[PDB]
UniProtKB/Swiss-Prot annotation:
Annotated catalytic residues: 8, 122, 167
Recorded GO CC terms: chromosome, telomeric region; cytoplasm; nucleus; peroxisome
Organism (species): Saccharomyces cerevisiae (strain ATCC 204508 / S288c) (Baker's yeast)
Known catalytic reactions: nicotinamide + H2O = nicotinate + NH4(+)
Keyword Nucleotidyltransferase among record annotations: no
Regulation: Inhibited by N-ethylmaleimide, HgCl(2) and PCMB. Competitively inhibited by NAD, NMN and 3-acetylpyridine.
Gene label: PNC1
Known function: Catalyzes the deamidation of nicotinamide, an early step in the NAD(+) salvage pathway. Positively regulates SIR2-mediated silencing and longevity by preventing the accumulation of intracellular nicotinamide, an inhibitor of SIR2, during times of stress. Also acts on nicotinyl hydroxamate.
A Gene Ontology BP annotation from the UniProt entry: subtelomeric heterochromatin formation
Extra remark beyond the main annotation: Has a cis-peptide bond at 162-Val-Ala-163.
Subcellular location: Cytoplasm; Nucleus; Peroxisome
Taxonomic lineage from the root: Eukaryota, Fungi, Dikarya, Ascomycota, Saccharomycotina
Record protein name field: Nicotinamidase
Amino acid sequence: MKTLIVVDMQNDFISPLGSLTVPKGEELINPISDLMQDADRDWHRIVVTRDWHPSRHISFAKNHKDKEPYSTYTYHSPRPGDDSTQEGILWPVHCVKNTWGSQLVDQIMDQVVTKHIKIVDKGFLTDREYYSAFHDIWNFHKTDMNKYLEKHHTDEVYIVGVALEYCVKATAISAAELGYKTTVLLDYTRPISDDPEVINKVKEELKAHNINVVDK
Ligand SMILES: [Zn+2]
């Protein structure tokens, strides 16, 4: 069956007042809301995701001495005895659990609450970044997503939301890797970077993993 995953439509990413506003982010709210309600699409399930950080999260520059927001940082595997590392970005503080910032934008919060839509929180563990809604950047800790998708007989997955080049792409990749037939409806996403070339880079990576990208 088809499932629709709506990635991080949250205040801190969508509101101008948010701490990590995606450019033209507000343009997504109504179209995504329509998408969520559209009979023709035959969504068997819809899942929405939230970045859900503790305030002391490792991914915020505020939590590293002598490092400012948007700097490059080297994460170290939290697995004891694992010494591999990954390059990261330290961000402004965003999506702290139970703060305006981390709420789904109202138009979507209202849809979730009135239609009882599954929420998946990612980014919860203090000690690691997660871009994908499926699992952390190490693929150590998994979320709920896959078991939920399976319970509801998902064979294909449609992904929308923000940010295109971080959580949208990472979520799409996980899904393809787990064997779902995966789609990104590009018209319903936006990048954090408002460099036009970014949409091509992601577009090409997506296709390399047999994720298929369409506009609408
Ligand atoms: Zn985050």
